[PDB]
Each structure stands twice: as C-alpha cells, then as structure tokens.
From a paper:
The nucleoprotein complex termed relaxosome contains the relaxase and other auxiliary transfer proteins, which assembles at the “origin of transfer” (oriT) region of a plasmid and prepares it for transfer to another bacterial cell. The F plasmid relaxosome complex contains, in addition to oriT, three plasmid-encoded proteins including the DNA-processing enzyme TraI (generally known as the “relaxase”) and 2 accessory proteins TraY and TraM, and IHF, a protein encoded by the bacterial genome. TraI is a multi-domain protein that consists of an N-terminal trans-esterase (TE) domain that contains its “relaxase” activity, followed by two helicase domains (one vestigial (VH), the other active (AH)), and a C-terminal domain (CTD) responsible for interactions with TraM. Here, we describe the cryo-EM structure of the fully assembled relaxosome encoded by the paradigm F plasmid in two different states corresponding to distinct functional steps along the DNA processing reaction.
Additional densities were observed in the “global” density map of the ss-27_+8ds+9_+143-R complex. These additional densities may correspond to the AH and CTD domains of TraI or/and to TraM, a protein that is also part of the complex. Near atomic resolution was not achieved for the AH and CTD domains, nonetheless we were able to locate these domains within the relaxosome. Apparently, this region makes no specific and stabilising contacts with proteins or DNA nearby.
Author numbering:
A (entry chain C): 2 to 96
B (entry chain E): 1 to 59, 63 to 113
C (entry chain D): 1 to 94
D (entry chain H): 1 to 19, 25 to 95, 97 to 100, 103 to 111, 113 to 115, 118 to 127, 129 to 130, 132 to 167, ...
E (entry chain F): 1 to 120
F (entry chain G): 11 to 119
Write the structure that this text describes.
DNA sequence: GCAAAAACAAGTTTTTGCTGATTTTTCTTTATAAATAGAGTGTTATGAAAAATTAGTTTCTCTTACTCTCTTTATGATATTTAAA
DNA sequence: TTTAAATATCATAAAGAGAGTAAGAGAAACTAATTTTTCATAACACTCTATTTATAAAGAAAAATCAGCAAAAACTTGTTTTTGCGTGGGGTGTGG
C-alpha cells in the first residue's frame, strides 16, 4: 500500500527536499487535515475531493456474534466525497 | 541526487570515485599527456567547471575505483559552489563532471 | 479550508521552505495519491485512514429531473475509512 | 603646546568633552563645519552623533565589526601653554589670548582617499568642535582647549580623514610628524598678541619654547611626572593622572591665592601696562608505547613539583596523548579518582571566505550574536541547515526558532562547537573566550582542586582565593573552556617550562621545531624515528645536551 | 611524473628538465651557435615565448626516458613571459620551460636572435 | 702564445659590440670564431691595407686553441707581418664583411 | 599592506494581484452501500536502534619542483718580460 | 734609448652542479554521518447482522476556486571602493 515513506521519497526525488524536510512536510500535511477536521472546518481539496463532517444520531446497534443489542453512541465522523475529476481517473482502475 | 548532500566537504582533497571502465580512460589520458592521474582529473574538472556551470543530468552501478584528487584553492571553491548548487556530494559532482569531460573531450591538450 | 489555504498554513509552519516549493509538494502529494488510486492500489496512513476502490456492478438508474430510466456501466469508485486518531479527534462526543 | 591623541569611542568622548565661569564655553570651527550648518555652539546629542557617525546631513559613516562600531571617532587637537598665560588669565586677562590663538585652525593637510587599484584628494576642510577647559587635572590653573577633530570630512562625497600606515602620506601621518611644527605654529600667536599687550616673553629651553615667579609653583603635574620618571614618560603620565574633582570657583581662587602666599610679584598689571636551548631525544617507534612512556615521564615530572607541558601536533593525536596523560596521572594519583562530566564550547574559526559557506554550519552547534543593546551575546543552537533557502534555523534557550539567511550573517555571529570532557582533582583547563563573571581571558591556564557534581573549585591566576564555577550539561549554559594538559606546538611561550614533547617521523618540519624550542627552556622529546637517527634533524639553532 | 603546478613561480633560477635524448642535441646546437649551453637555452626560450604565445603541447614523447637537469638563470622579461605562459597553460614552470625549449630546438636548429632561423 | 690581442680602432668597437651582442656571444669567443672564419674562407689572404690606423688603437683579448694558433702561425708565413696583424686585421675584415654570422652556411645579413 | 565592510550594477528567484478557465455545487425520487457496536485472528505501517557503508579527512613512503650554496672554467685586465730599430 | 709585442697572473663573473625544503602522487587507514536492516508494536482488515442513513443517477446553470501570467520585491553574485590600524612627540604633562 501507499506509505508516508513512499510519498516522502517521491517528494525527495521530484523536488529535492531534504529527507527530514520531506518527512516533516508529509507529516504536517496529514496533521493539518487532522486539525482542520478537529475544529469542525470542511476541507475542499479541489481536484481530489471534500472532507465533510457528519453528526450522527444514536442507533440501535448490536453484537453480531452474540446477537445482544448494544447501542451505537452518537458521534461525529469524517466523510470523503470524491470530486468528479478523481472518479474519472478511477472508473477503470482495476487492480 | 542528494545521496549524501548534507555532509561537509570543505577539504581540499577529493577521494574521487570512478567506475572501473573509466579508470582505464583516465590512465590512458594520463599516459598520453604525461600528467599524473590527479593532475589530469583536476585540470579537466577546472575546464568543465568553467565551461558548463549548469550541469543538469539524469545521474555506472558497478564496482568503483577510488583515486586521490588534490585540488587547489580555486578549483575547490568552484567545486563546493557547484555541489551546493546541485545538491550532490562533492565526490559525485566531481566524478560526474570528470566523466563528462573525459567522454566529450578525449585528449584535452588545449 | 481549501487547497490554497492548506498550502498557506503549511508554508507558515514550514518557514524555511519557499511557498512555491510547498505548493509544489502539496500538488505532487495529491497527484501521487490520485495516481495510486488510478493504478488500482490502496493508500493506508496510520492515524489518518485508508483509501480504497470498491466495485459497483452494472445497475439500473434514473434521471430524477425527468424520471427517465437509464441503465449504467459498472465502475470503481473511491472510498475512505478514517483512522483511529482521526476518529477520536474529529468526534466531539463520548 | 599641542598634544595630539586618538579619540577611542563616541560614547565616552561625547559625554566627557561636553561635561570662574569655565573658560568661556564650548565652541566649534572648521572650513567644512559651516557646510553642515553647525557653527559655534554644538549640542551634546549632535556631537556624540557626529562622533559615532551620524552626520547632520543624511550620511552615515558607521563601520560594524566584531559586533561593535570599530570606526575611529576622530583626533583630539589640544592647545596649551605654560603657567604664565594661565596666571595672567586667572585679573582675568581676556582668555581670548588663547581662544583666538587657537582660532590657527583656519587644515592644510586635510585629505581623503578615493581609489579608481590606485589616490588622495585635497579636501582641505573638516568639522572641529572646540571644548574649553579652565584648569589642569590637578585643578591648578591651566587654561587649555581640546579641539576635537572628528574623523568626518566632506569631490562632493564624504569620507574619513586620510590614513595610511605604509607611505605615511595621509593627513594623520603628516599631523603626527608635524607635531612639534604645529606646536611652534601655535606658540607664536600668544606672543604676537602680547606684543600689543606688552607683557614679558623669553625663551626657556629646548625646541625654542618660550615663557611671574609662581610659575614654578603651579607646575605640580610636571614636577610629579619628573619625580616619578626621572617619551613612552607617557606611562607615568597615564599612571599618575587623577580623575577630575569638583571645586567651587571662588573656593578655588581662595586656595590658589593662599598657596601662593610668598613668592610672586599682583602689581604686575599696575606697571607693565604703562605696554603703551638544550634538547634531548628518546626513540620509540610505536604510538602506544611512546605515548605511555611520555605520559609516565610527564606524570613523574608533575609529581616532584617540576613544571611540565605536554606537546603533540594534530587534534586526534592530541586527544590520544591527553587520554594517556590522564591515565598515567590517575595511576600516579595526581588526578583524583572521582571523575565527573561536563560540557564546554570550543571556538570554530571563521573568515570572510568561509562564514558565507554553508558546509561548515552543522546542526547541534552554537551561534552567539553580540547584542549591542543588552551588551551581551544571545546564544542560539543550530537546528536546521536548509539548502533550498540557504538559511540556518536557530533555536534559543526559550525554545523559539528563527530563520536567518546565510547572506545576512556577519562578524557579529560567533560559531562554537559543543564538546564533553571529564574533570577530576588537579585537572588543567584552558579558557577559550570571554567567560562571564571573571577577568580571565583566552589561553589562561586555570586549575581545579575539587568538584561536587554541581560546582567546581577553580584557582583564578592572581586572585589568591578559591573562585567557584557552575557545572552545566547544556550548550546554552556551557563554559567557554578546554582541557589544557596537552597543547599545540608553539602555542605558548615560556622561558623556563620543560616541554615533554613527542614528534613523529614526519613532523620534524622547521616550523614545528622552531615553535617547540619556543615553548620552553628544554624539551624531553620522544621521537618515532630510530635512536640517533632522529638526532639527524638537530641541524638547527637548538643544541643537544 | 608531471605534477600539478600549484606553487607560485617568481624566482629567476630554473632547473631545466631535459630528457637525456635531447640534452646532447642541445649541446650540439650550442656548439653550432658558439653560445654557451645555458645561454643558448635562454636565448631560445626568450624568443620561443615571442613566436608562439599559444603553443600546442606534445604527447609525452619521452616519458619513461631518463632526464638530466641544467641550471638556468632567466632575465626579468623572460621570467615574466614564462610566468604568463605558465599561468595561461596550467603546467609547472619547469615543464613549460622544458617543453618550449624542446619545441624551439626542433623547429629552429640554428636559431639566431629571430633574424636567422635554421639550416638543418 | 695562446693569448693574442686585436688592434680595434674606436670606430669598429661599436660595430663589434653590436654584432656580438646581437649574436649573443662574448667578445673573446666572438673574436676567436670570427678570426677562424676569416682564416677559413680566404687561405690565399693577401694585402688588404691598414686604412683604419688613423684612429687610436684599442686591444681586445682572445685565447687561441692549438688549431687556430697553428693556423695563424702558418698564415704568418703568407704575409711576413706581425702576429697582432695576423690576428686583428683579418678580424676587422670579417667584421666589415660578415656581421650577423652564425655559421658558414648563413651569409651576410 | 592587507583584508573587511560597504555601494553598486546585474540578473535571478520568489511573491502578488487579475481575470478568464476550470472545476465545483444544487435539485428532482429511488433503491442498495455504508454505517456499526465485541471479539478473535492474522497483517502491516512505522518509528528506534543497530549495523553497513560511504563520504571526507588524515597518514605513510617516495619523489621531485624550487631555491640556496659551493665550485669552475671564462672573460678580462693588470703586469712582467722581451727582441729590433 | 722606446716599443711593439710575448707570456704570466690575479679578479671575478657567466656557468654548473650538490644539497635542503616542502609539497605533489598514490595507495591506505581512520572516523563519524548518512543509509539501509532489524525489530517490536500498536493500528488495520475481515468476519459474524439487524436496521438505520446517504448518495449516485444527469444535466444545465450559479458560483467558487485556480493557475498562468505580468509585475514587482526579496535576493544572490561579482566587482569595485572606502577604512583602519599605528604612527611621533617642545612641554606646562592634557585627551575613559
Ligand atoms: Mg582638558
């Protein structure tokens, strides 16, 4: 799978940033998205997709193995709606 | 490119790393011109550094033979500036420029 | 925040790298992710989530502005599952 | 008499020279002084601004070097005469006989250097502020004026007053050479006015100097200088010069008139106006055995009380010899068993060709910038070296960071390299920089008696009482120190020290041998070369046993 | 063999490194000219520096052959021209002098102060 | 007598200085070489006349070898003149006949 | 007598506002896809520490460029000697 | 009695080598900084399912970023161009 190390090496090769610079830049790139989702903002990466934030009501969940009902706690989740452009590059992306 | 680019290379001596199939080229040039190997390498390095400041390149992959190059003050400063400008370590930049000058200009008597 | 604001924040935090280089790094990271998805490969970043493609079999469809039915071709679509750290930090409930 | 001295600092002279009604007051003159619009009276702030470099115009002559303005402020052109004129001006003889006499400054040597690889140009004018003084440093009557000539002169472009150590063709060289000539130039005008005023004149001695009985009594400074000394006289004059003490003018007049009770003439104006190296060598081939024997001999020398100095060239060889020396001293018991550890800063030399080259800047090293306002160095640690912006990222003790481009580094920045070193009883230490709180300076050989993991006992040379220093484990608080058991060849000069040196088969060079003899009276040299074959290198001035 | 010319060159005395194959030839030319050996070398070099300011080098003709050293003492103008050529060519002063001397021996075996050139 | 001297009047001294310095040769060796050249070219040397003798005479030294000394001795049979004549007069004739002379193959220039 | 700091011309890289291009967002009803609690089992990214290794610098033996010094004929003048008118 | 030579003999001055110095060649060794390997170890994936919640379908507008460009601002390079030592000096002994 794609890895932070792989993206760091790719940035190193294509841009010449030092290894520390590339590693810190990719870690900060992920951390900034985490922070912008932590404070409730929507992240609209044009050409890639949107990171919407959704607030969920309580649901009557259950333990599938034993069948005992266990309620799902109300929670807030991150939802990624891919843009039109990304989907076009992926429609035939057979592994 | 920046395989060892962060290291300090202020010294006046370069342990030039050469592919085993261009060490023969350097020995042949030394015999033809009478110069010592270090003399031939240093003078070709000076010529290339003056002629081509921009040396964009794609980047051997075989056994390597190491040679001692004793630069003078003027060549050392130019080589350090070039390695800082390109990101390569001093050894790699010197080897790339020496190899290019050897291949393009086979005699260099000037 | 949008992509430009993300680049601005990254440049502000990473003062030594020029802003143009930071913008290039962001665009290259996005292009790397998009290409890896186009190559039919999965992205996994511990603490952030995972990107994967799921198959959608050919199905029926409709044009809700007129109501005419139109069957469609089967295709892959991207999907995202948040990681543990992102789930904990984004949620504001216990 | 004209005595000429170099002004040192703007901040000193600006307050000093600006600080019986006095003589008359402060003043200024010069053929170029009026160009700036300043004449006669001059304020304190503008005077100090001109001394540091702030011209009344928009020009600025500041020269920053080593974190300080190294620009020389100017030259003090003093004017003075024997006690006769001051006794005259006490009657209160109008004072102007000296003021107009100096107002000979109406400057022929004034010139500036303008290159074009080759030349002086005859500017011929300057701005000179004249500060009038009433008495000598003994407060005895001596009317004189310090004409402070600032090193600021106007080809339509401003420049400093000419100087040239080689050739001596500049303004200052001519003024220094023509010192006595200018003194005799001033000498004449007082007598020229006196010829109309009718007072007595007579040559008194050397160089045509001319000069009423109490004149001998009011020369306390000259008499004291003669008694103390019997030109470079200047040492005694500097040593015996007491600072200025305040005196009330009428109380001063009373003291003068009382001390002059017997020998005199007034009644002078009542009638006169009616005017109308041995060496020895041991041979050991291998480094380990040679160093062990050398260190054992050094420890034996230290034990008996003999002053000894270790000596090898090369940093790595110095470290190896230091380790051997410490081990042998520990075996001999001179160095105490309970060793500790501490950090220290060793200087990294930099110059113009190198301080703008990134390759010698490394993460984990210390950078100090001399803050001119706090009058102390701000300490930073290099955290990042970035090629993309050619910029260093520096972290302070507070933990914040700033990015500085290498092109903006200059002499105000000092680069130090942190190191670690053990310490025990009797260890020898070398100060490598301006250690805070101590008058100790670079190269001084401190000694430490005991440590307690938190503080050190150190013997400052000449203090004769135990001073204490902190133990620090951080670069931000490390001491500018180094271990001083093993030195560099020729580093220190001593007429009596014994040098327990070791020289390899390739370090026999002329410079090393010359410095080695210079380092002490005798050398117990250990040589890598074979016995009596190392003696072949003794074809030099230093002698054998 | 031929080293890098790092050291600055300002002295007037030079040790001419001549291959033993050409030392005898220079002696022959010297007894042809009636000039002394060293003076023949100097008078050759000072005009060679004039005739060929730009001078293509030979390809290490003698190499492993033995060499002999001849004492040379140059004048101010010859020294200046030699140092200028040495700086413009990158060799050491000894090698530049030797190569130019060999070239002038080969081209003009009966040189006479630039007015008469050769017979053989 | 290995040492013999050349009667050179004032006028020819400047010409000798010019020719010898342009030749790059010392005065003694130049004199010997010129004397041997004149002896070689004209073994049938005959009376040329001492016209220049109307000026003050100055002497330039030389040291002969066996060959040139014997050649001068034999040439002194051809004239009956003094050895200073045998040495000097032919040197003056060569100096006025072949300045700029490297060897026999190179002519008067 | 030389650096070292300062001025200055010359590009060179980085930042900044403009405006069409380009991509995004909206609305209509309906089906599946996805969302998910616990727990067990096996994978896998990922930072720490260690081992490899390689750039950079220092060493050792030899050689010889460059200079200084000791010797040597070479050029030459001073000096004593000599045969003839 | 000169004098035109004949033949030494010191003076020294272009020559011409011997030695010392110090720095270049070349293969070699040491050292630490960078790179790759090894290794925990917690995050991730998949399954078990009853049921509650989102979102593609398309297609023409509003609109909301953007990117490429033109212009300026920070910035580095190379080259002049100015400065500062440190001085010399008669006394009345000054000028931190
Ligand atoms: Mg005063």
């Amino acid at each position: 799978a794609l890895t932070k190390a792989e993206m760091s090496e790719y940035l190193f090769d294509k841009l010449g940033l030092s290894k520390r610079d590339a590693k810190e830049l990719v870690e900060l790139f992920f951390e900034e998205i985490r922070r912008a989702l932590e404070n409730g903002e929507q992240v609209k990466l044009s050409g890639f997709g949107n990171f919407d934030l959704r607030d969920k009501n309580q649901r009557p969940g259950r333990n599938p193995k034993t069948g005992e009902d266990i309620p799902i706690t109300a929670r807030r989740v991150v939802t990624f709606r891919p843009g039109q452009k990304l989907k076009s590059r992926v429609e035939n992306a057979s592994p | 490119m920046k395989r060892f680019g962060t290291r300090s290379a202020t010294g006046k001596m370069v342990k030039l790393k050469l592919p085993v199939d261009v060490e023969s080229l350097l020995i042949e040039a030394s015999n033809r011109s009478g110069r010592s190997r270090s003399f031939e390498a240093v003078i070709r390095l000076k010529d290339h550094l003056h002629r081509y400041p921009k040396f964009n390149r794609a980047g051997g992959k075989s056994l390597v033979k190491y040679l001692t190059m004793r630069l003078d003050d003027e060549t050392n400063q130019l080589l350090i500036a070039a390695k800082n400008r390109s990101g390569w370590c001093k050894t790699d930049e010197a080897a790339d420029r020496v190899i290019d000058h050897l291949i393009k200009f086979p005699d260099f008597y000037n | 925040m949008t992509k430009s604001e993300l680049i601005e924040r990254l440049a502000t935090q990473q003062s030594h790298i020029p802003a143009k280089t930071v913008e290039d790094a962001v665009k290259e990271m996005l292009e790397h992710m998009a290409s890896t998805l186009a190559q039919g490969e999965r992205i996994e970043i511990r603490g952030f989530g995972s990107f994967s493609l799921h198959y959608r079999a050919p199905r029926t469809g409709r044009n809700p502005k007129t109501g005419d039915k139109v069957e469609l071709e089967g295709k892959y679509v991207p999907h995202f599952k948040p990681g543990k750290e992102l789930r904990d930090r984004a949620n504001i409930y216990g | 008499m004209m005595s000429i001295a170099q002004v040192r600092s703007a901040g000193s002279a600006g307050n000093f020279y600006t600080d019986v009604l006095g003589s008359m007051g402060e003043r200024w003159a010069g053929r170029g002084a009026e160009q700036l619009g300043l004449q006669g009276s001059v304020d304190k702030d503008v005077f100090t601004r001109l001394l540091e470099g702030r011209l009344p115009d928009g020009a600025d002559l500041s020269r920053m070097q080593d974190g300080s303005n190294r620009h020389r402020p100017g030259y003090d052109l003093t004017f003075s005469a024997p006690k006769s004129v001051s006794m005259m001006a006490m009657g209160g003889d109008k004072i102007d006989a000296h003021n107009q006499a100096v107002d000979a400054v109406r400057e022929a040597l004034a010139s500036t250097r303008v290159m074009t690889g080759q030349e002086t140009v005859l500017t011929g004018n300057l701005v000179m502020a004249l500060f009038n003084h009433d008495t000598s440093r003994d407060q005895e009557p001596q009317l004189h004026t310090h004409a402070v000539v600032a090193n600021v002169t106007q080809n339509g472009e401003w420049k400093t007053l000419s100087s040239d150590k080689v050739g001596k063709t500049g303004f200052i060289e001519n003024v220094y050479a023509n010192q006595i000539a200018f003194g005799r130039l001033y000498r004449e005008k007082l007598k020229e006015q006196v010829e109309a005023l009718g007072y007595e004149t007579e040559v008194v001695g050397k160089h045509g100097m001319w000069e009423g009985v109490p004149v001998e009594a009011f020369s306390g400074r000259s008499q004291t200088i003669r008694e103390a000394v019997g030109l470079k006289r200047d040492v005694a004059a500097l040593d015996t010069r007491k600072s200025k003490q305040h005196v009330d003018p009428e109380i001063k007049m009373a003291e003068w008139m009382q001390t002059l009770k017997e020998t005199g003439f007034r009644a002078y104006r009542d009638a006169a106006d009616q005017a109308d190296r041995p060496a020895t060598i041991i041979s050991e081939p291998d480094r380990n055995v040679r160093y062990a024997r050398l260190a054992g001999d050094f420890a034996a020398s230290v034990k008996a009380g003999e002053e000894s100095v270790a000596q090898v060239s090369g940093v790595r060889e110095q470290a190896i010899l230091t380790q051997a020396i410490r081990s042998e001293l520990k075996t001999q018991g001179v160095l105490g068993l309970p060793e500790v550890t501490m950090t220290a800063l060793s200087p990294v030399w930099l110059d113009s060709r190198s301080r703008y080259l990134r390759d010698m800047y490394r993460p984990g090293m210390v950078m100090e910038q001399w803050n001119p306002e706090t009058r102390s160095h701000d300490r930073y640690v290099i955290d990042r070296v970035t090629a993309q912006s050619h910029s260093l990222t520096l972290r302070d003790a507070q933990g914040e960071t700033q990015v500085v481009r290498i092109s903006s580094l200059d002499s105000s920045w000092s680069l130090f390299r942190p190191e670690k070193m053990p310490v025990a009883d009797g260890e020898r230490l070398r100060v490598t920089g301006k250690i805070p709180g101590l008058r100790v300076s670079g190269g001084d050989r401190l000694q430490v008696a005991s440590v307690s993991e938190d503080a050190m006992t150190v013997v400052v040379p000449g203090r004769a009482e135990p001073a204490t220093l902190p133990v620090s484990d951080s670069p931000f608080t490390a001491l500018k120190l180094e271990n001083g058991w093993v030195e560099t060849p020729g580093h220190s000069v001593s007429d009596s020290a014994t040098v327990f040196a070791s020289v390899t088969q390739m370090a026999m060079d002329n410079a090393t041998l010359n410095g080695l003899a210079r380092s002490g009276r005798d050398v117990r040299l250990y040589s890598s070369l074979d016995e009596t074959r190392t003696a072949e290198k003794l074809a030099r001035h230093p002698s054998f046993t």
